[PDB]
Design a protein around this ligand. Sequence first.
Ligand SMILES: *[C@H]1O[C@H](CO)[C@@H](O)[C@H](O)[C@@H]1O
Length: 36
Amino acid sequence: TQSHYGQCGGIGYSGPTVCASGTTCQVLNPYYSQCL
Ligand SMILES: *[C@H]1O[C@H](CO)[C@@H](O)[C@H](O)[C@@H]1O
């Protein structure tokens, strides 16, 4: 699972888009999405 303050899954990011329990994949920027 993607860690806190890391990029979870934005446009172009291929990988584990599911964040760790309690952290939410928030799309901050068009490509930058972060697990908060
Ligand atoms: C890998 O997966 C990511 C998932 O967000 C895509 O954005 C990318 O285009 C590729 O399919």
